[PDB]
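To close the chapter, one final illustration. This time we ask the reader to focus less on the individual chains and more on the assembly as a whole: which components sit near each other, and how the overall shape emerges from the parts.
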Amino acid sequence: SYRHFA
Amino acid sequence: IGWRREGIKYRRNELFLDVLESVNLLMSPQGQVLSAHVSGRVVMKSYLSGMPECKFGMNDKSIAIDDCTFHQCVRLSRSISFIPPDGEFELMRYRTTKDIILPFRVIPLVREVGRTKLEVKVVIKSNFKPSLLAQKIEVRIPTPLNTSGVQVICMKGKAKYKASENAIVWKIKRMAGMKESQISAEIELLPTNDKKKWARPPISMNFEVPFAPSGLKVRYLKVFEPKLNYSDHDVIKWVRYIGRSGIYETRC
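The assembled structure is written out below.
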């Protein structure tokens, strides 16, 4: 959903 | 470098990765996987200042990639390195076979009732984290050609008989992981040439899910641009995963 990588 | 001009600037330095996968399945009536595979591509959308040296890293060698081509800009060894073209582009393309997550399991039941009715019950089971929602679900159940009428009951979703297409089509807006749904149908039969067996074609599904069935997962995308006075910590980075059915047939 478009999240940051970690 | 004839894929990127030289004097590019942005106040807001940001990239986006899209992992896009088709998941293909043929299953026996018992529950054998006769055949399965995944085709995938990674697309990058990059708004980065200057001419930067990027290093893409995923959980390779953890999942197993049978084969994969790349884009011109990719320097080959042993991890992936490139100077991206600006905006949107296809970075890599790949195929997978081993250790695939199969988002749905389909369990068909069929009974003949004299020469006059067919009794059909199909169950679908979602197989993924409950945090997550599948959407745009379709289950396609075929009907014989001597079909007079069809009754269905389904507690979730909507379903109609499509006489033109010779199939019951069940549709569901959203369904969460680790769950169960079922449809019942009764198919009314006209009489027919006696020695026609029905070649029961497979029940097929369509769906979309927000993860990579391959198992693939993005680990880092590192940006270094030596002239200009931004660093890596300064770039805003995003992933999304979009997994969709191709051929997904279960033999009834």
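Residues 20 and 76 of chain B are 23 Å apart (CA to CA). The two ends of chain B are 55 Å apart (CA to CA). With these observations in hand, you are ready for the problems at the end of the chapter.
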